[PDB]
Amino acid sequence: IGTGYDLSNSVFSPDGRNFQVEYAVKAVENGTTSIGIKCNDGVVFAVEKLITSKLLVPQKNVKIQVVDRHIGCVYSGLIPDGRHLVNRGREEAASFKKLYKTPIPIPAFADRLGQYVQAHTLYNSVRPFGVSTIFGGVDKNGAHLYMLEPSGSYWGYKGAATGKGRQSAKAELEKLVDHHPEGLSAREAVKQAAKIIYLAHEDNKEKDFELEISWCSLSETNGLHKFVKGDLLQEAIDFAQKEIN
Template identity: 60%
Template sequence: MTAIGTGYDLSASTYSPDGRLFQIEYASKAVENSGTAIGLKVKDGVVLAVEKLIHSKLLIPEANRRIATIDRHIGMATSGLLADGRALANRARDEAQNYRDTYMAPTPIKALADRLGLYVQAYTLYSSVRPFGISTILGTIDKEGPSLYVIQPSGVFYGYNGAAVGKGRQLANTELEKLNLSQLTTREAVFEAARMQVAVNLRSYDLLTFLS
């Protein structure tokens, strides 16, 4: 195995002899060291919850939000570098607006996840850029019902019934697996998300819900 610091980690476009891209692994480490974000897809909606990181009593509570509204029917939660999350949220809003302007309809979340995944993946192809240091949870409720997607720093994305990213993801995912998400209401899911955030972090949190 190649040791870290042997030159193969200087560019996002350079593979090590054992087939690793260290820059993507470093981006994933940034996510693992960040606050926990949780997404739940339930029978009548989607709930997103993020750990609210307050590093100073002087900080305005709303100044470090890692949860955002992308369109009237789509929300986003991120774990990782705050500035990267804001940049990707702005890109997501642009993609959603472009789709609405072109097709005169709200963007399907799978199409948005695909576009954002390609955008994130583009930042792993060139030596002049670095990967996004975030994992992103997208949630929506539309005519197809509730949907939840997670985009990783590599650009790959998957659909989930429940997902957690960040430093508390293992405990949160264990708790998610205990739930019968398809039978939960949004009100019950809000309680479960809050319970998991408190269990994982013992800190404050932000919530965003989308109802049918």
């Protein structure tokens, strides 16, 4: 058959597959749960952020970084690698903002990152990214939500998920879209993001976790990406307890 086929990535294997990139989906598999609920008026990201020791500072680490003022980007897998992919799209977005003076569309932005991860798979000299991102936001064309696989694949989504608890998450997001196949509220969807992080914490029920939630919504936030904090965040927390009881 020939020996090789796993030392680079601009080889193809004899079956037309990759390696590194197929190996790269397993790098993403060790990551933290991260979900996205597409509501009618925006997106709600929520992410399990583990308190891995009692020596971490609570509510001072984040894995939800904003790109421009209206696109949240949230990742799992290799966390340093993941900041670099967000960093590239802050340069790309900023270039778009100068040239055309409008906030980069979600379909335009999807297109810009996508190429980038794909470009690293075309050389033997650059390591393919081992992160999967969920990103979206609100632009002038409505709300959209994207998941970008490490393979440089992305699609539209109504709910997406990544990490270890992707098995429970994917199953729990089918239920929420069969409760409301006619759409759901962005106020409401905060509370559901809470509920589907706590059920997905059962692959990872060894430890204890901090839930971080964010939203970009047209009718409560005016289409700007902000963090879910204060009293609203504690309501969602109390919601999740009562459900898992």
